[PDB]
């Protein structure tokens, strides 16, 4: 939950200024943990960017999140290193310095260090031709 959230925010204004009609927001992240893809879905209810939920591995809860100063606008290979705070409903609170990149999201805190690989989705986007090419060539 903290790792997935950092990649969005530490890349753009996802969940920032977002707005729809008579509905609610939704945004998802795919993690390639081990050899099995992992999907995490985040959404909001109310007029609150603050109130956020999560559903990973059929486990649901709520938390709030308060970020820090925005840094590393150039978002280079080092990308963005920012501290995060997360208040989960149960009652806890956490602080996480996340240096996130397209390749992976690294979270360091009292849990330890964990890097989660993001599900790779690249394959000659364009040149994807399965045509037989039987005759009348060159």
């Amino acid at each position: 939950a903290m790792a997935a959230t950092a990649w969005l925010l530490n890349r753009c204004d996802n969940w920032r200024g977002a707005f729809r009609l008579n509905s609610d927001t939704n945004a998802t992240v795919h993690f390639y943990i081990d050899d099995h893809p992992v999907e995490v879905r985040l959404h909001t209810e109310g007029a609150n960017y603050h109130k956020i939920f999560f559903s990973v591995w059929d486990h649901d809860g709520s938390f709030e999140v308060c970020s820090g100063p925005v840094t590393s606008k150039h978002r280079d290979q080092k990308s963005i290193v920012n501290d995060f705070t997360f208040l989960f409903e149960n009652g806890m609170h956490h602080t996480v310095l996340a240096v996130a990149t397209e390749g992976d999201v690294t979270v360091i805190g009292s849990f330890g260090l964990h890097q989660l690989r993001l599900l790779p989705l690249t394959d000659g986007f364009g040149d994807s031709s399965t045509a037989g090419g039987t005759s009348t060539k060159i």
Partner: peptide
């Protein structure tokens, strides 16, 4: 099994452009 948001596919060192 393919659901990006155009970037990645874009803003990466691997664009067909």
């Amino acid at each position: 099994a393919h659901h990006p948001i155009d970037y990645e596919r874009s803003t990466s060192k691997s664009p067909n452009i």
